[PDB]
Amino acid sequence: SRKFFVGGNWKMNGRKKNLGELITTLNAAKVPADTEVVCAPPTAYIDFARQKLDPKIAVAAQNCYKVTNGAFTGEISPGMIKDCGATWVVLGHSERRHVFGESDELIGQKVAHALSEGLGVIACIGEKLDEREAGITEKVVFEQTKVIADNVKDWSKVVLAYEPVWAIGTGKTATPQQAQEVHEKLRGWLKSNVSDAVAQSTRIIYGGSVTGATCKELASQPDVDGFLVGGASLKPEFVDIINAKQ
Amino acid sequence: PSRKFFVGGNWKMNGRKKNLGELITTLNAAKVPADTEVVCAPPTAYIDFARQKLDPKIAVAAQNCYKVTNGAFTGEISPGMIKDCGATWVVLGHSERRHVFGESDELIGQKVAHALSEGLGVIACIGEKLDEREAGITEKVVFEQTKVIADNVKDWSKVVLAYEPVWAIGTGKTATPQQAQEVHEKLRGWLKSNVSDAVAQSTRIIYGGSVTGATCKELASQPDVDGFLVGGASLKPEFVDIINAKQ
Numbered sequence: 476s477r478k479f480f481v482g483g484n485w486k487m488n489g490r491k492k493n494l495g496e497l498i499t500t501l502n503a504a505k506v507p508a509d510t511e512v513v514c515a516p517p518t519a520y521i522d523f524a525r526q527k528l529d530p531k532i533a534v535a536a537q538n539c540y541k542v543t544n545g546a547f548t549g550e551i552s553p554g555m556i557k558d559c560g561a562t563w564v565v566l567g568h569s570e571r572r573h574v575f576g577e578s579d580e581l582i583g584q585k586v587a588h589a590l591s592e593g594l595g596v597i598a599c600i601g602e603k604l605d606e607r608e609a610g611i612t613e614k615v616v617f618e619q620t621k622v623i624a625d626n627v628k629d630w631s632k633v634v635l636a637y638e639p640v641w642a643i644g645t646g647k648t649a650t651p652q653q654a655q656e657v658h659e660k661l662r663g664w665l666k667s668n669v670s671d672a673v674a675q676s677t678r679i680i681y682g683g684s685v686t687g688a689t690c691k692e693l694a695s696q697p698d699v700d701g702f703l704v705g706g707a708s709l710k711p712e713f714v715d716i717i718n719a720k721q
Numbered sequence: 722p723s724r725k726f727f728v729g730g731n732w733k734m735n736g737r738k739k740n741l742g743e744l745i746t747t748l749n750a751a752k753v754p755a756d757t758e759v760v761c762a763p764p765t766a767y768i769d770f771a772r773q774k775l776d777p778k779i780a781v782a783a784q785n786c787y788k789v790t791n792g793a794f795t796g797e798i799s800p801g802m803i804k805d806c807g808a809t810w811v812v813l814g815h816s817e818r819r820h821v822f823g824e825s826d827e828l829i830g831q832k833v834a835h836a837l838s839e840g841l842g843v844i845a846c847i848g849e850k851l852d853e854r855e856a857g858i859t860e861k862v863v864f865e866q867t868k869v870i871a872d873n874v875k876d877w878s879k880v881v882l883a884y885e886p887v888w889a890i891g892t893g894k895t896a897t898p899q900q901a902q903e904v905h906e907k908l909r910g911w912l913k914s915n916v917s918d919a920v921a922q923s924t925r926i927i928y929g930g931s932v933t934g935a936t937c938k939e940l941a942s943q944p945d946v947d948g949f950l951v952g953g954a955s956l957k958p959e960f961v962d963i964i965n966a967k968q
Contacts, residue, residue, distance in 0.1 A: 487789075487791060487794040488792070490801065490805040517797075518796065519768050519798045519802045519803065519806055521766050522766060537795045538795065544734060544736075546953075547733060547734040547821065548731060548815040548818060549734075549785030550734045551765055551766045570795040570796070571795060575796070575822075
């Protein structure tokens with residue numbers, strides 16, 4: 476049985492004050508033993524958040540680069556993330572891919588380098604609306620997963636996050652069934668392309684819109700192992716999502 | 722005015738808390754002249770760390786930022802966060818952003834306007850690549866880049882322009898002091914006839930090419946060179962020699 480995993484992606488939000496208040500809320504929250512909880516603060520606050528957060532919650536960088544040190548003004552390395560006490564990095568997030576044009580190859584190289592450096596990786600995939608309506612959900616999502624997998628030697632430190640990008644701001648929504656259909660298919664790719672052990676043990680988490688109201692039906696899906704939470708991660712309702720399985 | 726000499730240390734993607742803490746200790750003990758303005762740009766995960774450890778005489782800069790105050794931009798930081806961390810500058814348009822990460826002029830323009838509107842100072846970088854230089858179009862590239870920045874500047878008192886001779890990195894070429902001067906003087910001439918005389922006379926244009934212990938002096942003596950954006954030397958004791966380049 477895969478351990479339930481709840482990540483809170485704060486994206487580019489917050490200052491020390493309101494994030495300190497958020498953290499104070501999380502510290503007082505009772506996080507179940509069976510649930511693994513991770514918060515991804517803005518890059519300027521990885522160090523701050525790690526100092527202020529209770530050890531029971533892990534800290535993630537929102538991105539990193541693919542080399543340990545170098546001439547890359549504006550980037551950070553897994554070494555720096557580790558040095559700040561964070562144990563995870565989010566890679567391949569839809570905003571990196573689709574606003575900042577990060578290629579599959581780049582994401583793959585980043586994954587291999589973060590893993591070689593002792594970090595865990597939350598590796599994001601997902602298809603856009605035009606890809607969904609064209610019938611190529613599987614093609615896009617399998618090709619993205621392949622390039623990640625090509626760069627993974629030890630899946631015990633990886634978590635796959637499915638983002639239904641086709642549902643973000645488009646006027647379409649994903650049902651719990653539709654999330655399940657994709658998750659199950661992703662697991663089926665891990666089976667047909669990597670191994671059965673890896674399909675069985677790898678957390679595939681849902682990165683679509685998740686609220687206090689919908690998190691329960693979503694969490695009940697056989698192949699949904701948790702969430703990568705967007706906007707709700709900045710709010711008390713993140714604690715409701717930490718408690719989703721019941 | 723005259724223009725206050727300006728020395729920025731760009732640490733790029735280098736260091737951890739230990740060796741950067743030791744570097745900072747070196748800088749804190751250094752005597753920085755009153756007539757020199759010194760700024761250090763740490764990796765983004767260490768803006769807050771460096772500001773806490775660095776003496777107030779040295780300012781802190783982010784190496785990049787985004788163009789909006791908060792938002793759905795996983796991996797980015799805003800000028801509001803930079804300020805909140807005690808940093809007062811941001812480097813924008815650095816050649817590595819433009820040429821490795823494909824940041825466009827339009828994007829850099831928008832980032833400059835937003836950083837300025839948020840009360841940050843901006844070190845705005847420009848520079849031509851080798852293929853652009855050998856094609857004879859140094860001026861075209863460098864003037865177009867400066868124009869998009871200038872379009873997004875309402876107050877030049879908080880801006881510093883950095884010329885990076887990208888054409889001279891690793892490629893194998895070295896930029897002479899004269900060659901740097903020729904470009905700087907032309908950049909100032911662009912400001913004079915597209916912005917204003919007052920902005921031409923008062924705006925620091927700093928040199929972002931390779932600068933050592935040895936070569937900083939002739940460079941700093943050039944009429945239109947107002948200082949440096951130091952790359953790799955910024956992580957070393959010789960950055961202190963560059964802080965002292967005028968005398």
